[PDB]
Design a protein around this ligand. Structure first.
Ligand SMILES: *[C@@H]1O[C@H](CO)[C@@H](O)[C@H](O)[C@H]1NC(C)=O
Lengths: 51, 229
C-alpha cells in the first residue's frame, strides 16, 4: 500500500516549499529517501494548528 | 556524483548579452536545484541566481537582481543566464552548481569560465606550504555562530584557478563523497578547521571557508595551499 502521493498538487507544492526552505536555511538532518512518518508528523502539526 | 558541463568562455561586444551552457549530464536539475554563482578574479564568489527544481520560480542575485535573468529547465537540465549593459567588471567567472543539500555527491559545481567584456570570515594561515604526506590544519574565524539549525552550517570549497571548484567539507558532518577528502569539518569548530592527513600533490588548492549559516552563501578570502618541495 501507499498513503502519500508526492506527485499530486498539494503534496508537490508542500515538498517544493520545504525544498526551497532547506536550500536557504538548512534543517537538522536532510530528508533523503522520504518516508511516510514525516508526512504524518507534518499532518499532525497542521491538525494541532487547525484545532 | 552528478556531472556538469560549462564551456564557451569568451569575451563579447559592448553590452552584447551573454549566455553560458550549463548542462547537467547524467542527472536532472529537478532532484538537485541548479544555482549559478559568480566569482571575479582574485575575489570571493557571489550568488548570481537561485532557481527552483520544479521550474516554478527562480530568483536573481541580491546585488543586481533585475540586471540579469537566468532561465533553466528541469527535464532539459540546461540553464542559460543573460544580462545587458555588460561592463568590464561585469565579465566575471560564472559557474553552475547543483544543490548540495540533497547529498554530498550532489555538491558538484560546473567547470566555470571567465571573459573580458553575505558571509564574512578569515582563514589562516594564508601562506602555507608543506611536503607530501603532511597534515595541515587551517583555522577559519568568523563573526556569526558556528552551528545553525542543530548541526554546523558552514562549508569549505577547494577551488583552483580556472578549475571546477569542489566542496570538500560541509556542515561538519558530511564531507565530500566519491573522493572522500581526509580533511573535513570537526569538533565544536569556533573556527572552521580540517586536519588534512596525509596531503598530496592532488590535494593542493585554495581552500575558502564559505558559511551558509550567514545569509547568503558568499565565498570568503580563504587560505592557500601548495606542495612544498
Ligand atoms: C497519485 O498521483 C498520480 C500521479 O499524478 C496520479 O496519477 C494518481 O491519480 C494519484 N492517485 C489518486 C488516488 O488520485
Amino acid at each position: 500500500f501507499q498513503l502519500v502521493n508526492y506527485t499530486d498538487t498539494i503534496p508537490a507544492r508542500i515538498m517544493q516549499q520545504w525544498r526551497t526552505s532547506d536550500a536557504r536555511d538548512h534543517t537538522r538532518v536532510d530528508w533523503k529517501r522520504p518516508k511516510y512518518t514525516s508526512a504524518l508528523t507534518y499532518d499532525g502539526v497542521k491538525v494541532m494548528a487547525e484545532a | 556524483e552528478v556531472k556538469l558541463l560549462e564551456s564557451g568562455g569568451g569575451l563579447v561586444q559592448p553590452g552584447g548579452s551573454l549566455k553560458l551552457s550549463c548542462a547537467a549530464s547524467g542527472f536532472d536539475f529537478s532532484e538537485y536545484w541548479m544555482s549559478w554563482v559568480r566569482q571575479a578574479p582574485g575575489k570571493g564568489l557571489e550568488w548570481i541566481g537561485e532557481i527552483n527544481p520544479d521550474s516554478s520560480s527562480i530568483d536573481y542575485t541580491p546585488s543586481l537582481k533585475d540586471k540579469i535573468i537566468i532561465s533553466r529547465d528541469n527535464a532539459k537540465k540546461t540553464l542559460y543566464l543573460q544580462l545587458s549593459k555588460v561592463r568590464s567588471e561585469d565579465t566575471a567567472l560564472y559557474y553552475c552548481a547543483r544543490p548540495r543539500g540533497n547529498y554530498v555527491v550532489m555538491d558538484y559545481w560546473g567547470q566555470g569560465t571567465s571573459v573580458t567584456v553575505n558571509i564574512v570570515l578569515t582563514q589562516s594561515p594564508a601562506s602555507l606550504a608543506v611536503s607530501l604526506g603532511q597534515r595541515a590544519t587551517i583555522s577559519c574565524r568568523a563573526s556569526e555562530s558556528v552551528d545553525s539549525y542543530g548541526s554546523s552550517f558552514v562549508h569549505w570549497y577547494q577551488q583552483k584557478p580556472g578549475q571546477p571548484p569542489k566542496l570538500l567539507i560541509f556542515l561538519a558532518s558530511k564531507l565530500e563523497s566519491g573522493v572522500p577528502a581526509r580533511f573535513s569539518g570537526s569538533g565544536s569548530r569556533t573556527d572552521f578547521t580540517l586536519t588534512i592527513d596525509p596531503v598530496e600533490a592532488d590535494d593542493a588548492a585554495t581552500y575558502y571557508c564559505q558559511q551558509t549559516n550567514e545569509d547568503p552563501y558568499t565565498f570568503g578570502g580563504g587560505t592557500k595551499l601548495e606542495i612544498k618541495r
